Amino acid sequence: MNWTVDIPIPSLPPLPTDLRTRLDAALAKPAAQQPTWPADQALAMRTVLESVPPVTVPSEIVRLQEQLAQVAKGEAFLLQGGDCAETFMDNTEPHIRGNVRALLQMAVVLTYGASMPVVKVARIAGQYAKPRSADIDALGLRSYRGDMINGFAPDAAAREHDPSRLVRAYANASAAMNLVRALTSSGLASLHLVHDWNREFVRTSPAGARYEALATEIDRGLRFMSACGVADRNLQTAEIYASHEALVLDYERAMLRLSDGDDGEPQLFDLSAHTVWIGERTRQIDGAHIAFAQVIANPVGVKLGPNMTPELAVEYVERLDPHNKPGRLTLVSRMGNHKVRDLLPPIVEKVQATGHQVIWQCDPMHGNTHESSTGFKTRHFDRIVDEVQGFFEVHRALGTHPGGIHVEITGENVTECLGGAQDISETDLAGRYETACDPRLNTQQSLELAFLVAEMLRD
Amino acid sequence: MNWTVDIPIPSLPPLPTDLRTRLDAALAKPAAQQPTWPADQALAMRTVLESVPPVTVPSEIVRLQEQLAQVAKGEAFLLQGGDCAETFMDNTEPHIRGNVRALLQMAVVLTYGASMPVVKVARIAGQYAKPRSADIDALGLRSYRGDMINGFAPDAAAREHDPSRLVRAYANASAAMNLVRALTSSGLASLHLVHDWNREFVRTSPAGARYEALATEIDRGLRFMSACGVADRNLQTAEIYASHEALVLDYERAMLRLSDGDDGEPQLFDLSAHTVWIGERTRQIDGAHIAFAQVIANPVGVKLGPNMTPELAVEYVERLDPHNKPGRLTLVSRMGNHKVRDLLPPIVEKVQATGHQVIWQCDPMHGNTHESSTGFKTRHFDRIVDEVQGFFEVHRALGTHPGGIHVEITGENVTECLGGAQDISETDLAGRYETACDPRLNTQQSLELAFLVAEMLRD
Amino acid sequence: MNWTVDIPIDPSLPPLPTDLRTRLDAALAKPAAQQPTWPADQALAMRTVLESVPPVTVPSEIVRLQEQLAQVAKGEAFLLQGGDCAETFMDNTEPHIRGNVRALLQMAVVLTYGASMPVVKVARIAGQYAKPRSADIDALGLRSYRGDMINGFAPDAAAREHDPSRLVRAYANASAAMNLVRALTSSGLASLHLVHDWNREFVRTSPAGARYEALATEIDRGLRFMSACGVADRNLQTAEIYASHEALVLDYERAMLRLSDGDDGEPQLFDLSAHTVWIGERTRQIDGAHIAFAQVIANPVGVKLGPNMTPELAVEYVERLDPHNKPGRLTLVSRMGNHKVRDLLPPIVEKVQATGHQVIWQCDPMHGNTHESSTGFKTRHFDRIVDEVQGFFEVHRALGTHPGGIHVEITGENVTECLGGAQDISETDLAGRYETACDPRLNTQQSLELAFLVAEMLRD
Amino acid sequence: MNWTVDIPIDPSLPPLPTDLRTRLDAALAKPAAQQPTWPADQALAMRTVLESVPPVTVPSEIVRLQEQLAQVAKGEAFLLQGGDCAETFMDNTEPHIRGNVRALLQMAVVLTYGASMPVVKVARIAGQYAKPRSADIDALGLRSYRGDMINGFAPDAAAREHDPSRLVRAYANASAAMNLVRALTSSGLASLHLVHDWNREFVRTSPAGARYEALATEIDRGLRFMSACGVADRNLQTAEIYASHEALVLDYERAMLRLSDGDDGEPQLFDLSAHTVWIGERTRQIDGAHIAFAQVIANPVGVKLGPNMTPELAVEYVERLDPHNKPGRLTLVSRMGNHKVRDLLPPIVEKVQATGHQVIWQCDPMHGNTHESSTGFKTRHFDRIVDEVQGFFEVHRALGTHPGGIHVEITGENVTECLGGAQDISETDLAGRYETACDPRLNTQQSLELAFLVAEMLRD
Ligand SMILES: N[C@@H](Cc1ccc(O)cc1)C(=O)O
């Protein structure tokens, strides 16, 4: 009941000596949150992934870098979203399409609200690993760490760390990515279609009166654009980039490719994605993740939680954006809504005074979690909205650019987060919980967030 | 103190026999409102104008026809405006530019309000003749009939009908038209510049609070368009077409040219303009003006005042749109605001039942005139607005398309019409009256009308 | 000790509608030649996996291809179809895929110039992993290699057994390949001027470069002219390369069936394992399962027609596969041999034109011109390939019909598989780099050279 | 009894700023050759009329031309300038204007192909109504015709008197002409493919058609290639034809001065009677009013350089007229004669390049190659014109500089004015249709033929 892949038996060009040195130095540093599987099996899987067609190509990553530059300069806005954890079982056409649709829907609303371009980065085609605080979960089982490592099912065997999951992760990533590319160059990306869905959502949301005026104004803007002779064909094809947390270093090193351009010197690109981030757990300043990020040419992000200090933030900036390339680095604030107004300003002030131009991105989810009385991990919608609101106050008081958001969402009608216009309750949550990890905003709530964020952008 | 033009001494291709027959039959019919100057002098001036480069060319008139078709079908809107009477003395760069600017300004606002394209036709490059009810004016002088015929100065000599004014009219028309074409392909036509002026007008109008929300929504629509990657270069260059009242038949017949296309049969185009209209005075159903309009291939309009009947309107339609070509004919309603709600519906119903698709255009000026206690002919702004409002009610109750407006305006701060946000009074009017005929809405009032019309279009 | 890694498989979506399943079951109860002999229960489980994976292509790309092929069938565009004889899983790499994509784009710019009309680019890629065989025993005494979707090339009994997990492995490879084709076609790889310069290296370095110089300079001057008029790459619609393979393994194709949205038009059945597929010479029985599977799907399709073809049998393909008279829905692919095309093709084309249907007539030069070398290797002569294309063009010019395209087997590798061409590959040369897992392909130079020769035919 | 009609003239706008007027008065106190001799008070009244008319051109078109000519000066574009020797008011008709516009567009597509770079199209039109003279008495014993802006062509004393109302008549004609040029350049007249087909009629019907066939087919195939790649007319930026004339009559030019908006850049002085102007051979005194008027305006300008030119005098033109080093602000127009260009041009170009400035080097073949026929008429030989262009190109190739353009006198009429060419116009032929009111123009065929020959020079 399985498929069989050969271990090739030459293949990669050898790295120039300095890249090999710097890559080895980076991987020899300590690395948190890594799977515990045998080195020889890891090595065999890396040798397979070293021969595969990449998920992305370097030109796409260079274009993304240029678009991110604009965001860092206060002339575009970044929307990053999708599943908390993608699963092999739900890597289907409807699930992919629903996430693509939700992202495009949010994006048009935010574009209108910001009056500037929106860069769309999905959490997709690789978001298959997660860190854990505890090795042992509530049931006394070894913790689930996403499908790149082990299985979600609640038995011990399924929780064993499996290295064959690295190659399965790629098979799933490459399939999803192929479809995302097909979808972004189809009618799914027509602005006028994508907007139409907003019209359904205003009708069928119980808070629709609340969003009606903005949705009609967007509709009018779109018609106005058409009225001036702009048809879909002339516009740029929609671009949705791929991202995940660079967690599993066995996966990410096997997906490195050596590439030309940008002054003609060889560079390493992680071709498992367009951009990756380093989470709070793995961001050790001398650890392998950060040192790995220094070696790759892709845009990167770092998650900054409530014990971050202005000084450590600056050191992240100096280490990861050493050439001062606007857009190369994104700092992702995840403070909690009760803390973002106090904790973010001095980080922002200090980083701004270095002269570097980073993207300030708000992740209003990770700081605002709690277990419910009914058993399911969950987040209140109002706290999410309030963190983003706080984030915008911080930048407005400083005259800096609130550059983006990073959310966990899905294009399905899941019940995972409390609240919204549907008023999802603790009792409601049990009925439809579909996440393999953290609770995502459903279709309706992610849309509603886009509308509220658009108002924060307009004011 | 004059320039000297030779009478050529061959030049036009001979008309195909049927065009010559139909043209002669049309001109032999009686013609109201014609200048009384000697036939031999008229003939010499026609012979000069028969050799000149035309003001327009047929392809432009074919494109206009296609754009008017859209308006007749309920998918675009027509804005027609400029001077009541152009004068030789004010045919200057600033005056032309101010009228061009005012038209483009109004057009963007109306485009947003209608959510469909707006066709821009200026009263320009030929609007040099007007009909009169009385031969003798208030001062006992022979009436001024526009600079194509005679002079505005209040003495008898200057009021003599002069045929050399036909060639001077063309010299002025061709100059103005050259500049309109230069202007529409310059930065003057950038939408984002043109909109910016709206911002000045909201600030400096005393009713600016009233228009602020719509002006900000338009600004947002424009930014949104830019945010999606639409730059000025991609858009169609702005097109402003030329029109005047086809009054002086000596002028209009001399400006006829024979042309190919549209099924390859020879057609006559009046190359003095893109489209012309027939006013209330000259619209005799068996008169030379209407018969002339039947022979030319240009889009035409007919002014319909308060004694129009549904039956005569149908006969205009059958005579002028005999092939059923949407857009070929525009019926211009000029009823007065107190009468438009009663008089227009049955005309519209009857014409709609013929199957022809005309453009319904409102001229809310000509029905709403009065002499003031202070001496100057004048119009109240509120009555103008109310006629347009009535016009829209009529079409909305019938489900027909309110297709356009036809206004007299200027890009200067004249005091000619009573009212508006500036609250121009009878006492105010004397200080700045600059028209050679009827009172035009000034810059501010024509803008304000565009905003109010945009709201009528949105509701 | 086996140098393999096993990959486990596991929950599905709605089934296809019952009424459509009823039709499909009826068509697929027809006999099917050349099918793998794995067990039914395992094939079923693998099909169940593939019924819910993300598709390789999507319906609106196929509807778009249909519109472009309608243009080819009406005589206003030209079809270029080309790539590996058989893709292998071990060679399904970035460089190999980049090279085939490059080679197709290079051929296309040249044929576009020659033809003065748009060229539709269809690769044999992302699924060309199954082939028929004549003998169930090969020269080494083993059961025959059927393509990676069925068994392995290695000359070992274990590897030659029919393994249905190879259906999923095929999918994984097709989807990765297609992902990369999409990426590359929207990159600078597709820029017209860049791709042409390659053409210029080719003239510089080919030993017959002197004779293609003129057409190459002319192409270059055409490109520089485009650009001098203000045309930048941003002004041109992005490069579209479509995927195709021979629809052979019906467990794979049926599991990749999908129903469209229905928003554009009533929902229709598409094979989303590719954009277009063709039925080969050995599986085109008129009453067989291949031709019937082809009738049921909405994709454009092809049928290979070899020297035994009769004009009446060709007419039956047209009535079965283009019942609604949709231009470009059916391609007839002539593969007759260069010594026979001039005789055998004309009456097929007369009979088919007389039906009123608008098929695309495509030439496959390579298949009918295969032979063995004295040095062992299977091979084809470049001149014979060329001459079949020439003869195909003469038949069409004589008849007043559209020579609509070519279908060729090529790689962007500098392999030594076909004899002849400007490099004058010899029988001794074949052992240098004979890399095909099936028939001899034109190498990178030969495939370009062929494109320059077909451009001259298009101009004539 | 006079067959004329008189047209009366009449209230003005702000004057030009005082500080700018002060500068202009100083420059125009310099002596001015070849000026009309009408009275000052009447000239003044006519200038006052022209100071408030709508301009012929507007500043942003001139700033755009400047950017395109900067590209010519850097070696990435080519200048085509062409039209009537002298426009007449009586021939300023739709057909005559359409014909010159067509001829320029036809030449341009061919030279664009040849050069593989954009061609900037500048017509001599909408103001070419004044010419210098050598003698104040002509062959009929009358004072000389100076162009319609000064006096009339008819051989009568009354008509030859200098009439300043002709300044306004010139304006009226220029503006009408320009209006029509603008209309035509945004019509189907400007569509690349349509204009080329004309080229194809020309090959069919020229008696030397056989020798331009190859380049014409190649151009055609380039166009069909553009279109096969998806380029439609809507994808191309609209045709821009710029207006130029010789700035000769300083009452006209000064009255047409305008100050720009200043929004783009600090407001500058532009002659809005045209987009660009040049100073002729007889009015280019370094300390004269023409060169000084040219220093004060922002338009791009040209200076004609004939056989008496010295490299030092050329350097002074560069320092006076391109003081800020703005590429393409100055064009140097060589008109040396075909027997002299190879000798005389090289040291001028060496000296000017050594200044660091980037001028456009333009060839005027026609002017230096003028002679009288045995049959009376003034005339030029096609071969000599051709050979001067050839010699100009050799000088530049030898020096490594950019042969930047040509400047020619042409019409779209089938006139018989220049000798030679494929029609082999003879001395007897000249009386058939000698229609120029001044020098012999290339007719429609000859001007196209020249374009095909210069394209070959650009390719070489
Ligand atoms: N995959 C190699 C890195 C590498 C990447 C690209 C190369 O071309 C070569 C080596 C590693 O993990 O060590």
Ligand SMILES: N[C@@H](Cc1ccc(O)cc1)C(=O)O
């Ligand atoms: N093409 C190689 C590697 C591969 C593995 C898994 C894939 O999903 C894709 C490619 C194989 O099939 O063995």
Ligand SMILES: N[C@@H](Cc1ccc(O)cc1)C(=O)O
């Ligand atoms: N001007 C002519 C009409 C006409 C127009 C065009 C022609 O080509 C000829 C005649 C008239 O008034 O009678």
Ligand SMILES: N[C@@H](Cc1ccc(O)cc1)C(=O)O
């Ligand atoms: N070109 C003719 C006719 C003409 C008359 C007046 C113009 O405004 C333009 C042209 C002339 O100058 O006599």
Ligand SMILES: N[C@@H](Cc1ccc(O)cc1)C(=O)O
């Ligand atoms: N998501 C399923 C099916 C799948 C199989 C292979 C792929 O290559 C892609 C998807 C799995 O992981 O088993």
Ligand SMILES: N[C@@H](Cc1ccc(O)cc1)C(=O)O
């Ligand atoms: N409007 C002025 C000036 C003018 C003169 C000639 C023209 O050709 C144009 C405008 C006039 O009528 O006298």
Ligand SMILES: [Cl-]
């Ligand atoms: Cl290495």
Ligand SMILES: [Cl-]
């Ligand atoms: Cl790349």
Ligand SMILES: [Cl-]
């Ligand atoms: Cl006639």
Ligand SMILES: [Cl-]
């Ligand atoms: Cl036309």
Ligand SMILES: [Cl-]
């Ligand atoms: Cl689709």
Ligand SMILES: [Cl-]
């Ligand atoms: Cl301007």
Ligand SMILES: [Mn+2]
């Ligand atoms: Mn999460």
Ligand SMILES: [Mn+2]
């Ligand atoms: Mn009026």
Ligand SMILES: [Mn+2]
């Ligand atoms: Mn084969």
Ligand SMILES: [Mn+2]
């Ligand atoms: Mn001359």
